Each structure stands twice: as structure tokens, then as C-alpha cells.
Design an enzyme around this catalytic site. Structure first.
Site, PDB file in Angstrom:
ATOM      1  N   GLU A 122      -9.554  -5.062  -3.135  1.00 41.72           N
ATOM      2  CA  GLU A 122      -8.831  -4.032  -2.404  1.00 41.72           C
ATOM      3  C   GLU A 122      -9.798  -3.213  -1.563  1.00 41.72           C
ATOM      4  O   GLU A 122      -9.537  -2.944  -0.387  1.00 41.72           O
ATOM      5  CB  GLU A 122      -8.077  -3.118  -3.369  1.00 41.72           C
ATOM      6  CG  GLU A 122      -7.019  -3.837  -4.186  1.00 41.72           C
ATOM      7  CD  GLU A 122      -5.821  -4.263  -3.360  1.00 41.72           C
ATOM      8  OE1 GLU A 122      -6.002  -4.661  -2.189  1.00 41.72           O
ATOM      9  OE2 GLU A 122      -4.694  -4.212  -3.889  1.00 41.72           O
ATOM     10  N   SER A 131       0.798  -1.232   0.000  1.00 38.79           N
ATOM     11  CA  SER A 131       0.000   0.000   0.000  1.00 38.79           C
ATOM     12  C   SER A 131       0.828   1.279   0.000  1.00 38.79           C
ATOM     13  O   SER A 131       1.448   1.627  -1.007  1.00 38.79           O
ATOM     14  CB  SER A 131      -0.959   0.005   1.192  1.00 38.79           C
ATOM     15  OG  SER A 131      -1.781   1.163   1.183  1.00 38.79           O
ATOM     16  N   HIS A 161      -7.886  -5.989   1.150  1.00 36.76           N
ATOM     17  CA  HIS A 161      -6.600  -5.318   1.261  1.00 36.76           C
ATOM     18  C   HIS A 161      -5.684  -5.984   2.300  1.00 36.76           C
ATOM     19  O   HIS A 161      -6.120  -6.354   3.394  1.00 36.76           O
ATOM     20  CB  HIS A 161      -6.821  -3.853   1.636  1.00 36.76           C
ATOM     21  CG  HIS A 161      -5.660  -2.965   1.311  1.00 36.76           C
ATOM     22  ND1 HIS A 161      -5.192  -2.794   0.025  1.00 36.76           N
ATOM     23  CD2 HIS A 161      -4.879  -2.195   2.102  1.00 36.76           C
ATOM     24  CE1 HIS A 161      -4.175  -1.954   0.038  1.00 36.76           C
ATOM     25  NE2 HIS A 161      -3.963  -1.576   1.286  1.00 36.76           N
TER      26      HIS A 161
HETATM   27  C1  LIG Z   1      -8.480   3.804  11.654  1.00 35.98           C
HETATM   28  C2  LIG Z   1      -7.963   3.100  10.625  1.00 35.98           C
HETATM   29  C3  LIG Z   1      -6.576   3.301   9.971  1.00 35.98           C
HETATM   30  N1  LIG Z   1      -6.409   4.021   8.577  1.00 35.98           N
HETATM   31  C4  LIG Z   1      -6.955   5.425   8.879  1.00 35.98           C
HETATM   32  C5  LIG Z   1      -4.890   4.096   8.238  1.00 35.98           C
HETATM   33  C6  LIG Z   1      -4.468   4.450   6.732  1.00 35.98           C
HETATM   34  C7  LIG Z   1      -5.382   3.881   5.526  1.00 35.98           C
HETATM   35  C8  LIG Z   1      -5.091   2.377   5.387  1.00 35.98           C
HETATM   36  C9  LIG Z   1      -5.701   1.315   6.161  1.00 35.98           C
HETATM   37  C10 LIG Z   1      -5.301  -0.025   5.893  1.00 35.98           C
HETATM   38  C11 LIG Z   1      -4.349  -0.309   4.863  1.00 35.98           C
HETATM   39  C12 LIG Z   1      -3.776   0.737   4.088  1.00 35.98           C
HETATM   40  O1  LIG Z   1      -2.897   0.438   3.109  1.00 35.98           O
HETATM   41  C13 LIG Z   1      -4.155   2.104   4.345  1.00 35.98           C
HETATM   42  O2  LIG Z   1      -3.781   3.285   3.726  1.00 35.98           O
HETATM   43  C14 LIG Z   1      -4.832   4.296   4.080  1.00 35.98           C
HETATM   44  C15 LIG Z   1      -5.948   4.437   2.962  1.00 35.98           C
HETATM   45  O3  LIG Z   1      -5.615   4.751   1.821  1.00 35.98           O
HETATM   46  C16 LIG Z   1      -7.474   4.202   3.247  1.00 35.98           C
HETATM   47  C17 LIG Z   1      -7.806   3.484   4.615  1.00 35.98           C
HETATM   48  C18 LIG Z   1      -6.971   4.052   5.857  1.00 35.98           C
HETATM   49  O4  LIG Z   1      -7.336   5.452   5.946  1.00 35.98           O
HETATM   50  C19 LIG Z   1      -7.210   3.313   7.368  1.00 35.98           C
HETATM   51  C20 LIG Z   1      -6.800   1.731   7.212  1.00 35.98           C
END
Ligand SMILES: C=CC[N@@+]1(C)CC[C@]23c4c5ccc(O)c4O[C@H]2C(=O)CC[C@@]3(O)[C@H]1C5
Ligand SMILES: C=CC[N@@+]1(C)CC[C@]23c4c5ccc(O)c4O[C@H]2C(=O)CC[C@@]3(O)[C@H]1C5
Ligand SMILES: C=CC[N@@+]1(C)CC[C@]23c4c5ccc(O)c4O[C@H]2C(=O)CC[C@@]3(O)[C@H]1C5
Ligand SMILES: CC(=O)N[C@@H]1[C@@H](O)[C@H](O)[C@@H](CO)O[C@H]1O
Ligand SMILES: CC(=O)N[C@@H]1[C@@H](O)[C@H](O)[C@@H](CO)O[C@H]1O
Ligand SMILES: CC(=O)N[C@@H]1[C@@H](O)[C@H](O)[C@@H](CO)O[C@H]1O
Ligand SMILES: CC(=O)N[C@@H]1[C@@H](O)[C@H](O)[C@@H](CO)O[C@H]1O
Lengths: 531, 532, 531
Positions: free
Chosen positions: B334, B201, B447
Site C-alpha cells: 500500500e 481507499s 496502492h
Molecule cells: C498529488 C497527488 C494526489 N493525492 C494528494 C490525493 C489523495 C491521497 C491519495 C492518492 C492516491 C490514492 C489514494 O487512495 C489517496 O488518498 C490520499 C492519501 O491518503 C495519501 C496520498 C494522497 O494524498 C495523493 C495520492
């Protein structure tokens, strides 16, 4: 020229605003103070009378909304507002204001019934200005009053003892009612006929005021729209000390003693406390840790002044206000609003009993269902069809029944048995003012009864003939009850008193009477929790 | 039977021997070695500098802090991705530029094994290195596994769009870390001539960036981007950035007089203060209020002129990247459960009708970048075929996924291919047993569902079937082989076709066999639609 | 089931603790508020009534001790404690609590004598929790009450005028006595027979309450142990403005007006004030500068509310409300404890006339002996022997006589000549509970009587039979006095009333009457002090 009313504390100046189909203009007073601003030392203490003024107070500007999450307040306000466009609000601790909308002729001397609205929002967000009382006031010829009370830490922080009993927000609502009992005549309202009503936290509050001694003689009829004193989530039972300490610590305060925590908390800036409220992540479901140790919001407690014992213990005593009471709910209380506003873990409409048992557990703070009881509960609901698409929809019903449905009826019943006029309803309609992000299938979601009750269809552009028809009817019922303690009237489908027949009025596109609202769920739940 | 002590350039370090079941050769592990001087005070918002050498023996037996990030948000992501039996609760600190090392090499004899350097994901806003335990993989494939940390959020990505605070701090820490491996890895039994960077990611987009960066030249040799690339619309911020910086400056209570001023102001804010500003910005959550275009879910990569000299699109457009074996890949769903769940997506009803569909796709501007006029046409090219309420919801997530990762990946891959460099693609389809309980049995290949194989969780975590165990074993074998020959293909493994003109790739899962033309039709429609 | 009593302000929940040889378990109540927490506004002001509470105030955990130097506090609690183990405590401004030990059978009506203990500590440190009243309350069957009051800057800061009169601690003590008048009845105690006692600064306080119109009917028997209103070190005669200025400057405040200092100091944090206490380095012999200026304590002052004239002047006028007063000292008041804890420069165990003179001068804050008179004093005491060993012992005798010896006896005589029942004693014994670092040669050191008055032999281990006897006797003597104004009783050596014969009891291994205690001393000092 502008309307000027002589209240006890001084002259208030409003503004005239007429509504289509009404020669008489409603007199609108924005931002009348009913209590001394709760600043500094007055924080975490009961409200005090407001100081009088020398000339004419200009009551024509929307007062600030009680400090709260700025983004939460705004979103929520946009959703429930019945106005054409949502009015932007400024935050303040000086927020004990109420807005008056009166159709009465201020030149003469009228005495129209008074309907006091207590907004919902979880004792965390919400504002009075969110609701414009023009339509209702004009159409049913009643004096509408929107009041504000202290929210979050500011209005419900408790130490469990005399150093900070809590329910500051509730004592505010009482103060508000008391202010109306003293000045409302000045606006053409009859202090001898005040009806209190609200939805969600507002309904819960209305229900709490029916149970408190500090509220006797301050109102004569009560309506509870989707929320009561048995909606466990809003009422904090058992030792609250831990939560006070968790907050004290987060605000960066020592916890040596109760007097010390409250003393350290009054030192924090409005800004400071807001940042704690933010760090705490209230109004959101925690997905990690033990759900039992999670606490979505600061609510009502048994302070020993307002509430002398758990509502349950009180109803049993039949010791409360036996005034006409109207309790109601909406077909799908968990339809989309609440879950969407609580970051609820639900994406795939496919829901297996396994995954289902997990959320029901994580939902502990909302439903409060001991883990070893989750299987019996999940079964009685999702055991229906093998349709994983039908289970999630049924799962949502599960939540609604616990949180609102069952509690309502129980209240309705005990009040009934307390020898007083009782009324119930089930709102099953889907307004076109619903957010775009809301699925077309969700009908009767949380807060859907608001647009009808508050005549949105006359303030907003685009309603259908049906919606318009519904609102008029709903406003008609609410008003009648406001003056007679009986919603029934001419040209209105008969509404059965809620007696042993357990008849209520199904309010919707088609509005007929029915009987035995949630009869089985009550029995089912009353049993399981009795395990 | 005494502890392993290794001498690095800046001084001796002391780890601990640990052995995995079924493996005689124990693994020497080191936790929290510093690869740069803590970026405190004046060092905030500036390139990382060499760590200070030490006099005696540094204890590298304890886990290092994770860079300041949303405490609750990071821990949550760590429990859902950790391949350890029990999650390691971590502490927050600006002093976070460390790296953990796991090497199965016999330190006594002079070894030179391949080095796989991980780069955690988490939207460049959360995440820690200590979440991905590297034991299993090292033990099972005889590869030195290094997991690194890097400045996140404001600390690692604030930009004023000019010299006063170019940006990419985090990406530079990442380079700094690779530089470290080069100069010290031999001491741990690795071969600095065989370094494979790989990440999932944000970690993955970082790998595709470095591949595009000059400052990364000669620092890595093989590359693996797991579900995230330099074209993932949401992590790379093109256009004027000044507006964001100011919104942030302003939140922390700073003037915006000049770039110089904003930067200086922010440099005096305490760690706590910036953390409160991060919360207030309410990042990594979908803004359902206001204008979707003004919404800014996360600070990300920028064209600074040091790391990235032109837009990813322009760089790969020309031959301005390095022709090294690159393995790009994606998961079946994803946008299945994880991301949406973690961004507060509104889907209670779990079923959507065309209308509500185009609506939400709009609020999702920051995640997909689709103009309001294109929204209708795209929504139909996906939710039309069927008139099923829930099938639209499903087909609606595909939409986002293809736009976010699917399409980007293929394009990044096709180009590399067209550059003459060896390329390999894959699509992970499998639902791991270690999935979140709150996750529906219906979500397959969500994902990061591939992370449990790549890191061999089936060997640390309990309760896994013969299937899973065999899959991790196959994946790890594929990855390691890749990290050794730049070609995943090996003895006793399905044939993985090279992603050449025939566009062959590997569909990994319970049934793993090759396929061709991955998202060819999705690439067409989107390439087309974004062309106005 | 734990014991529950209803006090004017609400139900309190305590705990039952049985003692060896006694059936009726003792009802112990810990941390009961007798006043509204002196925080913010209330800092540096009269103590106030506590806010009543709503349910059952569970009092089964020790209260904090008023902010003071932690180290000094804990070391002292350790040395004076009579508990098997010394309970660590927390410092806090929220400290106005008191503990109760009632042996009565709360189920039946009881009216047992009440003994209120006022802890010593120089008014700078100390805590009520340090003294466990189990043994005494049970053995003599009286109700023991341990009270707390503000300390250091918090309880004794004054500017010598209306803006901060001073004596906040004593007002707290009087406040506790008022509580006991209106509550102890509910604990089997007789509010018509309340006896106050304390040692060191506590004995001085009891001595002050005895002379103040503010306490007129809050007690009927008094007992001062090693410390009286004439113990100059604890009383601040003259202009106090210079000490308040020094404190404000150190606190970081201006000195523009009395009102300003007070205000600014009243705005500093608890911590900022503690740090001031530390920087002032109170309670230590100031080896540098002019002896005459060093202020080792922040004590009592002639505020005008509590004390209208100097202690000396108040003893002259023979008021019409009097009570039996017991005044006593120990054989070696300045033996070890005190100088050890004040960092006395007496380390070579030896001493010559010249070195003594130098040491006496620096002692100005303790003995108040003019530089011109040092030789007379020094020669009158060490000129006897010839060796630097006995000379040193005599030097510690000079200080002791100036600090407690003479002041005490002067107080006793005046009480006698006023017409009320007076009694004296000289405690001479080395309790086994002494500090390892205390050399075995010191007998009757400061505070050594405490272990007998509170029955350490019945709580702490390894007491010889003789020690166990001495304690039983002391307690009975104290109790007979608590309920008679006369300590005499069946099975006890005879204690003569302190009248013109100046008969007093010598308590120790061997107990028996004697006469003219410190007679010649009182003589040599009264004269010399008038030069
Ligand atoms: C509270 C949850 C954590 N929180 C915010 C971190 C970063 C991000 C993410 C997650 C899980 C895996 C990832 O690769 C990842 O990247 C971000 C994204 O793009 C959308 C989702 C997300 O906002 C979410 C979970
Ligand atoms: C506008 C805010 C979202 N909105 C989430 C949903 C349902 C409800 C609620 C919240 C948080 C936790 C709850 O348990 C809960 O129940 C409802 C209630 O009674 C009043 C407050 C509230 O209206 C509010 C937040
Ligand atoms: C560090 C403080 C000095 N330190 C210990 C000396 C001796 C003693 C005392 C003080 C001031 C005046 C006294 O008369 C006196 O006697 C002692 C006592 O009993 C309790 C308090 C105290 O321990 C304290 C202050
Ligand atoms: C009391 C006061 O502030 N006066 C205002 C006046 O200035 C203003 O013109 C009017 C309408 O806006 O409302 C009133
Ligand atoms: C200075 C330091 O970090 N302390 C570590 C300790 O935590 C560790 O347990 C020990 C052996 O591993 O080596 C040392
Ligand atoms: C002295 C001490 O605290 N013991 C710990 C030990 O339990 C732990 O296994 C080791 C490695 O983390 O560090 C040390
Ligand atoms: C019912 C209840 O709360 N009991 C508590 C007890 O657990 C606690 O030990 C004591 C002192 O803290 O106070 C009481």
C-alpha cells in the site's frame, strides 16, 4: 552605550554583541535600507535611492523578508540558518534591507575588508537574516554584510522587452553593492576591498555580477559556492514571452500587450501576486505534461542592461571582471536537500535504467537534456553495475554534474583563461546541524559548506571537535581570499591556484589538494550537448 | 439504430450505445445524470436535496464536472488510475453531484441485473467518477455499473463540530446517490434489490462508513472495501474538530466569533476563494515543519450524530452495523510508490538508518498516529532484524502500510465476521503493465494496482499480456459473482475461502490461491502497542 | 531576409511585401511605438516619449486600436478599409502606435516625400491599421505613415481648466509628427517634406494642426478631406464643464471639483470607461429631450496649448509660417454613410416641410441651427420643388452644406487670403467597393474618395478600368502635391489654384476645373447665421 554610525542618509543605531573569546564586541545593525521601498508603481522597475531621515534610525530589528512562499521560506531558512534557533520572519515587498556585522572599532577609523553575502533560494525564497555574521566577523576580523534582493515574480518577471526587462532582483544586488561602496567606511569597512559571495541562487548571482558592466568597480573578489551563471535552471534563455503570459493570465490579467500585462500586474495586491506564485507551483517538479513546457522558477534573463548576451557568449568574449574568483561545489549537490524540497519522485532506492530515463526526462527543467539524448546519458552513468541500489546513487550524481559540477569547472576554466586568479574546491563533509530527516550516508549535500563558512559551530550548541576545526579553517581561507585574493595562509593546507594543472582544494575532515576536478564529466557533457 | 432514451422519475434521459470488442450485446451509457439539486450558495455545507425534474429530454452524453479540488492534483491522480486508453481532462465545478451509468441490459425487455455502484478514492480531497470507465466490466459480467460523484474537500467535509455545520456532506451525497439508484435503476435494467457498493481507499473507507451508517440502511446489499476502511486512522477525525474549522475559517479570512458566524462567512466565499484556501492549507502533503500533531493533511469523516452516531470503533464494537456480505481487501505494498510519491515524502537516498527512521515516523503522525514514545519500540519491531540500509527503507514502508490499511482491514473484517455476516478477504500482489513509468519495476502491489483488474483496463488500454488479461478476467468475475450471490466463488475460479474463524483469504496475483491468517501478527503487535 | 532599421529608440524588424508591377518590394513596419503608453497616471495627460528598447523590436503584427465601441469601430473599418480583407483588431488604452510603408531601398540613402495619414472616426472610433498604404507608397513612391491617437473620453475629456485641458488626441497626433521628424529618415523618407492628410475627423485634425503653434514645423503640406476646423460638430466652443459633469456622474464619480472628477475618472478601469461611452450613447442622434443639450461627440476644445483662440479667430491673424493646404469635399457628404451610422429617423425616404423642420431641430448638435431660423433654412432649401422626394434630397443637402460644404470653403478662402497656396475639389463618384446596403443612387457619399486615394483597385477585386484610372489619377494628384505643394503634373487634367476666381477641380469619372464651389451656399449661410 549603543553604537551609532553616521551614514549618508542619516544616523543608524545598532547594538553591541560580544562573542566568546573576543573582548571586542561586534557592532550589529539590523535592517538598514539601501533602496526606496519597491511599492506600487515602483514594482517591476530598477531600484531607486533611499530617502534620508532626520534623526537616528533604530537599526536593531530584523527587516521583513521579501515576499515569497511563506512555508518554503521558513523551511529553507531553518535548514541553512547557522543560529541556535531559527528567527521567524514577516513578509513584505518593502524588503530591500541589508544587515551589517562589524568587528571594527567604530571610535577610531579602521578599514577592514568587506564580505557581502547574497543568499541562495532560487530567486524564489531566502532571507538575509537567515545568516548571522557574528562568528565570521569576530574570528576573521572582517565586515560581513547580508543583503536582500527581490524574489519571484516581484524580482524576475520579464516581458522580454522595455516594458519589463526583468532582473529586478539583480539590479537590487547591484544597488546593494553601490550602497556599500558609499557607506561601508562608516562601519570600519574598506570600500576598496569588497568580496561578494553566495551559494545556489546566491552563487549564480555572484557569477552574473562578474559578467555584468553595471557591477564593475563594486567588488574586487568573488566566491561562488555551488552555483554559477551556467547552471541553466536559473538562467532563462530564448523567448520568455510565454511565461510572462502564463503568469499574467493566472494572475487574472489580459495579455493584449506587454505594456498592458505589466500595467495590470502592478495593480494586483501583494496578497494577490502571492496567490499566483502559489498556483504556479514553482520550486517543484511537474510530473504531468511536457517537461519542456514546465518552468520551476523565474530567473535571470538577458535584459540588455545587466546582461548584454548569454553568459556563454560573454565568457567567450573574455569580456568581464577578471577579479580573483573562487568557485566550488559539494560532493553530492543532489544528496537530499534539493530533491526533498522539490518533491522529486524517488522512494525505492532501487532504480532501473528504464525508470531512470523517465525521471531524467521529467527533470528537463533542471538538467535540460533533449529526449533523444537521454539513453546515452543514462548509460554513461547507470551502465556501471547491475546493482539497482547503486544506479540511483549514480543517477543522483548525474544530476549534480549537469546542474552544478560541469558548469562550475567550465566557468572556472574560462575565467582562468581570461588571465585572472582562479580557485576551486570540493566540499566533502557532513555537519551535525543537518536535518534529522537526512540519511547518515549523504555527505557533502547542498549547502553543507555554509555552517563552516559561517562559523555555525560557535553559534550553535553541540558541534564536534572536528566540525569546529573545519569551520575555523574554512573561515580562515575565505577571509584570506577576502583580503588577498588568495586563500593560502600559514597553518592552512596549501591551496593551489587553479591553472592548467587544474588543482583545487578538497575541503573536508581531511583537506588536501587534488587535480582535474570533474575532468571527464566536463568532456562527456560538453560533447553530448554539442550533439 | 437510434439512441437509448430512458425515463427516470425526474424526466427522460438520453445516452449513447457503445460496444466493446467481442461482445454482440452493446452497452447503453449515460453521462452526467443529476441525483441532487446543485449545492450552490445557501446549499453549501448542507444536506443534499432532490434534483429538480425537467420537461423534455436531458442529454446525458457528455461528461460532468468533477467537484472542485486541486486541479493539478486531481488530474494527476486521474491519469494514474484511469482505465481508459486516453485520460479524459475534466472541468471543476461546485455543481458536481452527477452519476454515470453503464448498463449491458437490453432496455427493450424488462431486465433486472445486479448493480455495482462505485465510489472513487482520492483522500476525500480529489477524484472524479468519470475516471473509472465502466464499459468493460459491465460488458464482461453483465452488470449495471454506476459511478457516482460526491462533494469533496471543504465543500463536502467542513465541520464546526455542532449543528451549524455537522459535516459528512460528501457521505450524504453518497447516500443520496444510493437512494437515487433505488428509485430509478430499474429504468436502466438494474435490480434495486441487488446493489453492491464498492470503492478503493477513500472510496473504500466510505463504503465501510455507510456499512456502519443507519441512513444507508436498506440502500445497498453487498459491500466491497478495496484498501481503505472506517478505521483508516487518517480519514476519520475523532476528537475536537473546532480547531481545524477555525484554522480554515481564518485562512479564508473569516472570523471565528461563533460556529454560526464562521459557516455564514464561508458560505459567501466564491468557489475560487475556497479553492485558494484549499491550496494554502496545502492538503494531502506531508508537513515536515512545525508540530506533526498539529498537522492536518485532509478534512475527513466525523461523528456528526446523523451519519455516524458513535466512533467507528464503538459501532463495530457493538452490533450496530448491517450484516450484509462484505468483502474487505488490501494490496501487497500500500505504501509502495503512489501515496508517498503523492505526499512529497522525503526519501531521495532511498535508504534509512534507525535514527532517521524513527524521525520520519514522527513527522508521519497524521498518517499513523503513533506517540513519540511508542515510535522507538515500533521502529525496532520493524527495522531491527536486519542491518541493511535499504531493507530498512522497504521494511519501513510496510510499517506505515500495516498501520494505515493492513491492520485496520483485518479488524474491520474480523468484527464483521464476529457479527455473523459473511466476510471475504484478499491481498492483491501484482504489478500492472499500466503502472506509472516513473515507478520502479521493484514495486509490486502498490496502492490501487488492483484497480486495473477490477475495471478491466486490459480490454480498453493497449499492450497487455495474456497474464494480465487473464487476471482482470478473473478479478471482474470474482467481483461480479460477489455482487450477485454475496459470494465471489464461481465456476472456473480458484476457491475463495470465507473469512471465518480459520481466517482464510485469497492472495490474488499471477498465482492466485487461498491462504490463512492475513496480518495476524501485525494485528497483535499494533493492537498491543496502541494499548499503552 | 526581412528589413531591419535603427530608429532613435532601437532596431525594428518589419516585412517585405511586393506589389504587382513593381520590383522594389515595400518595407512594411507595423505597430511602432511613438509614445509611452497612456496608462494609469498618464491617462488624461500629454503624450510622452517612448522608452528605448534593447534588441530588435519585431514589428510585424497590427497594433491594437484605442479603446472605443468595438461594434462601431469594426463596422467603420469595414466600410472604409481598402484591404482585400478587413483585419479584426483588439481594443486597448495601449494604442499609441503607427504603421510605416516605405518603398525606398533602405540599403541606399533615400529622401522620399512622407505622407502621414490621420484616420477619421469622429474622434470617437477609428484605427490606422484600417488603411493599407501598399498601393500608394509603391505607385507614387512616397512614404505613407498611418498614425493612431487616443479616442473618445480617453483623448478628448476636459474640464475646461488646468486639471484636464483636453485635446489629448491631437497632442498624440503632434507627437507622431515629432517622431516622424526624428525617425523617418531611417526609412528612406525626407523629414523636410512631410505632408499630413486625413478625412472626416482626421481632416478636422489636420485642419487643427494647421492652425496650432504646436505643430509649426512638423509638416510642410496639408490636405483635409471632408472635414475642417469649422465643422462645428467636432469642435466644442463655450463652457465644457457640463459635459465633463455628465460624464463623471455616469462614470460614477463626484463633481466636487475639476481636480476631483479627473482624479476619480482616472481611477476607473478601461472597461468602466468603455461602459460610460456606451451609456452616453455617443454618435447617435438624440431623438429625446432638448436638441441643444445632446452631445453626440466628445471633441476638440480651446485648451490654450494646442488652440489659443477659436478656429475662426485663428484664421484671421495672418501668421508668418504657412504651407500649401488642399481642402476638399464630396458631392453627397450626408448621403448615406453618416446618417446610416447615426441612426437617423429618416426612414420613409420622403419628407414634407413640417417633418423636415422637426428633423432639422433635433439636428442641432450637427448643424447648430437656431430654432428661430429653422424655417428660413428649411424653406430656402425645400421650397424649390413640390414632391416629398426631391424635398428629402435637398434636406440631406442642407445638412451636408452646414457640416462640410460651407465650413470647408470658408477655410479654403481664408487660407488663400493669408497668402499660401490653396486648392479645392469636389469628389463625385460611386466606388464599386460601396456597401451592399448603400443604394446605387448615392454618388459621392462620405468617404467615397478613400478608395481612390489608397488604391483599392489595386488591392480589392473587380474594379472596372475606369475606377482603376480614377485611382491612379487621384494618387498621382495627391503625390504631386505631397512633393510640390502643387498637385499638377504630366498626364493629368488641369487643377487650378484656388485663388480669387475660386477655381477648383471636380474629380470623378470626368475630371475638370470649375469655379465658385458652394459660392451661393456660403452666402446664404453666413448671413442667416448672423441673425
Ligand atoms: C498529488 C497527488 C494526489 N493525492 C494528494 C490525493 C489523495 C491521497 C491519495 C492518492 C492516491 C490514492 C489514494 O487512495 C489517496 O488518498 C490520499 C492519501 O491518503 C495519501 C496520498 C494522497 O494524498 C495523493 C495520492
Ligand atoms: C530551499 C529551497 C529548495 N532548493 C529546492 C533546492 C535546489 C535549488 C533549486 C530550487 C528549484 C529549482 C532548481 O533548479 C534548483 O536548483 C537550486 C538553486 O540553484 C537555487 C534554489 C534552490 O536552492 C531551492 C529550489
Ligand atoms: C456611430 C457613430 C457615427 N458615425 C458612424 C457617423 C459618420 C462619421 C462621422 C462622425 C462624426 C463626425 C463626422 O464628420 C463624421 O463623418 C463620418 C466619418 O467619416 C468617420 C466617423 C463616423 O463614421 C461616425 C462619427
Ligand atoms: C528611534 C526609536 O524608535 N527609539 C528606540 C527606543 O524607543 C528603544 O528604547 C531603543 C531600544 O529598543 O531603540 C530605539
Ligand atoms: C445541450 C447539450 O448538452 N448538447 C448536446 C450535445 O453536446 C450532444 O453532442 C448532442 C448529441 O449527443 O446532444 C445535445
Ligand atoms: C456537434 C459536436 O460537437 N459533435 C460531438 C461529437 O463529436 C461527439 O462524439 C458527441 C459525443 O460526445 O457529441 C457531439
Ligand atoms: C523570430 C520571430 O519571433 N518571428 C515572429 C513571427 O513568428 C510572428 O508571426 C510575427 C508576428 O507575431 O513576429 C515575428
Amino acid at each position: 552605550s549603543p553604537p551609532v554610525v553616521d551614514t549618508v542618509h542619516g544616523k543608524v543605531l545598532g547594538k553591541f554583541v560580544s562573542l566568546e573569546g573576543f573582548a571586542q564586541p561586534v557592532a550589529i545593525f539590523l535592517g538598514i535600507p539601501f533602496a526606496k521601498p519597491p511599492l506600487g508603481p515602483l514594482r517591476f522597475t530598477p531600484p531607486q535611492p533611499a530617502e534620508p531621515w532626520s534623526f537616528v534610525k533604530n537599526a536593531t530589528s530584523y527587516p521583513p523578508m521579501c515576499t515569497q512562499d511563506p512555508k518554503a521560506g521558513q523551511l529553507l531558512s531553518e535548514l541553512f540558518t547557522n543560529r541556535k534557533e531559527n528567527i521567524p520572519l514577516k513578509l513584505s515587498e518593502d524588503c530591500l534591507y541589508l544587515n551589517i556585522y562589524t568587528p571594527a572599532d567604530l571610535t577610531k577609523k579602521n578599514r577592514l575588508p568587506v564580505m557581502v553575502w547574497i543568499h541562495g533560494g532560487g530567486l524564489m525564497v531566502g532571507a538575509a537574516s537567515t545568516y548571522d555574521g557574528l562568528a565570521l566577523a569576530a574570528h576573521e576580523n572582517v565586515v560581513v554584510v547580508t543583503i536582500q534582493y527581490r524574489l519571484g515574480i516581484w524580482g524576475f518577471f520579464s516581458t522580454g522587452d522595455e516594458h519589463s526587462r526583468g532582473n529586478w532582483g539583480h539590479l537590487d544586488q547591484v544597488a546593494a553593492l553601490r550602497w556599500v561602496q558609499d557607506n561601508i567606511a562608516s562601519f570600519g569597512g574598506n570600500p576598496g576591498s569588497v568580496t561578494i559571495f553566495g551559494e545556489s541562487a546566491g552563487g549564480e548571482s555572484v557569477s552574473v555580477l562578474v559578467l555584468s558592466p553595471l557591477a564593475k568597480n563594486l567588488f574586487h573578489r568573488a566566491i561562488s559556492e555551488s552555483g554559477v551563471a551556467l547552471t541553466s535552471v536559473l538562467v532563462k534563455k530564448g523567448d520568455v514571452k510565454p511565461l510572462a503570459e502564463q503568469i499574467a493570465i493566472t494572475a487574472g490579467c489580459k495579455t493584449t500587450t506587454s505594456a498592458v500585462m505589466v500595467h495590470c500586474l502592478r495593480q494586483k495586491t501583494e496578497e494577490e501576486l502571492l496567490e499566483t506564485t502559489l498556483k504556479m507551483k514553482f520550486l517543484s517538479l511537474d510530473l504531468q505534461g511536457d517537461p519542456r513546457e514546465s518552468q520551476p522558477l523565474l530567473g535571470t534573463v538577458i535584459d540588455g542592461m545587466l546582461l548584454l548576451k548569454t553568459p556563454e557568449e560573454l565568457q567567450a568574449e573574455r569580456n568581464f571582471h577578471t577579479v580573483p574568483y573562487m568557485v566550488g561545489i559539494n560532493k553530492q549537490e543532489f544528496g537530499w536537500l534539493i530533491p526533498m524540497l522539490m518533491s522529486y519522485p524517488l522512494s525505492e532506492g532501487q532504480l532501473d535504467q528504464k525508470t531512470a530515463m523517465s525521471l531524467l526526462w521529467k527533470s528537463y527543467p533542471l538538467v535540460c537534456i533533449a529526449k533523444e539524448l537521454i539513453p546515452e546519458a543514462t548509460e554513461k552513468y547507470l551502465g556501471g553495475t547491475d546493482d539497482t541500489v547503486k544506479k540511483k546513487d549514480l543517477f543522483l550524481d548525474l544530476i549534480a554534474d549537469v546542474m552544478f559540477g560541469v558548469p562550475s569547472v567550465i566557468v572556472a576554466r574560462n575565467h582562468r583563461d581570461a588571465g585572472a586568479p582562479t580557485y576551486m574546491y570540493e566540499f566533502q563533509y557532513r555537519p551535525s546541524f543537518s536535518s534529522d530527516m537526512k540519511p547518515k550516508t549523504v555527505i557533502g549535500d547542498h549547502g553543507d559548506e555554509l555552517f563552516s563558512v559561517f562559523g555555525a559551530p560557535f553559534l550553535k550548541e553541540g558541534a564536534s571537535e572536528e566540525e569546529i576545526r573545519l569551520s575555523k579553517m574554512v573561515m580562515k581561507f575565505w577571509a584570506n581570499f577576502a583580503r588577498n585574493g588568495n586563500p593560502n595562509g600559514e597553518g592552512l593546507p596549501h591551496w593551489p591556484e587553479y591553472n592548467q594543472k587544474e588543482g583545487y582544494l578538497q575541503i573536508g575532515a581531511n583537506t588536501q589538494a587534488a587535480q582535474k576536478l570533474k575532468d571527464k564529466e566536463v568532456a562527456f557533457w560538453t560533447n553530448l550537448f554539442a550533439k
